[model samples]
Target: EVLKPRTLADLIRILHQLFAGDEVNVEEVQAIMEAYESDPTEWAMYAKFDQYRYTRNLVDQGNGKFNLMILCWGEGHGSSIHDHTNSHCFLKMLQGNLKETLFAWPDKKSNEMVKKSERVLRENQCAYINDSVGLHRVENISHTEPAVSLHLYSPPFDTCHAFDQRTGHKNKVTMTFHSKFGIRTP
Candidate 1:
């Protein structure tokens, strides 16, 4: 069952079946994410906490088809305004609390940003988004507690850009894994 303890293959098989086709929808993805989040045991064992930056570990980096990640956010730490390149994303908050802030450009040529919306996702809550919708910033909302979240993306990205909304400038950034499977980065 999907709800039981999951292995790397289970995650891969499930995502492949759901997104390998063109019929993948936001609701379907969100639902799957919710199921994954509903029970933390599936991903909790791989989580690692940090005192400075958030830890993003690769659970499964699929064969150029998709990727699965588990991010552990330290207390009070947050992410910059970042886009997921062109990859579609599904995020499930597994522990503590996180606040996701979305930003949008007013016009095509402008660098100025407009606040789209903010969502405070607690344990078991999820979000579905992509670069087309807007850029996003996620932060651990609790001062005393760290947070963990699961992310799923299709056609894994090799590169993504971080945005400076006020200046409308972006820089290409390479994504790295804090841990691969259960191996930590040295």
Candidate 2:
């Protein structure tokens, strides 16, 4: 039987072990994510919120194999439709509610995006996606409450493309972290 993680530190250890090999076993990682329940106190220190946009706080770099982060979303904050640059992403909700919308890739000639699916993720729920799966947009659906989520990216990426729904325009964007290793950063 696989050991269930009781703390953020425990989860980190398990992730490191799972990602140690060249090829990540998606099923194993997903199993761990589905089983572990997030404890607010364990990750509260890293939940740095922002007024204008969501904050991404780095928890671990995973020796370049993957990245673990805590993302905090203030009321009414949302992300632009974006692609994952061919990486696998797993997101687990820690608190509050988030709405995720999946969209088909822009058409080659028409350059239009089509909505495929949507879902609201509540606390303790998880979702997974990759470039092949589709592009997506995530938002904190609550108007009065802040939301928190834990994210894992395999074969970590530093840059990705953001898509505009109306015009189907895309732009490369660099990812940044508000904090690293539990400490705030400039």
Best by TM-score: 2
Q: Mind giving the per-residue lDDT tens digits that candidate 1 earns over 1-186?
A: 334224435655777777767677777667656765345656666797778999888888666667888899988989878888788898888788899999874455756776899989977777888988888888999888888888888868857877776876777888777887868985
Clashing pairs in 2: none
Top of the candidates by lDDT: 2
C-alpha RMSD for every candidate: 2.9, 1.3
Residue 96 lDDT (model 2): 92
| TM-score to true structure, per model | 0.86, 0.95
- Considering only N, C-alpha and C atoms within 3 Å, which residue pairs clash in candidate 1? none
Number of clashing residue pairs, candidate 2: 0
Error of 2 at 132 (Å): 0.3
Candidate 2, lDDT over the whole model: 0.89
Instruction: Quantify all predictions' global Cα lDDT against the true fold.
Output: 0.78, 0.89
lDDT of 2 by residue, 3-108 (tens): 6888878889999888888888777787787678888878888989988999999999998989999999999999999999899899999999899999988865
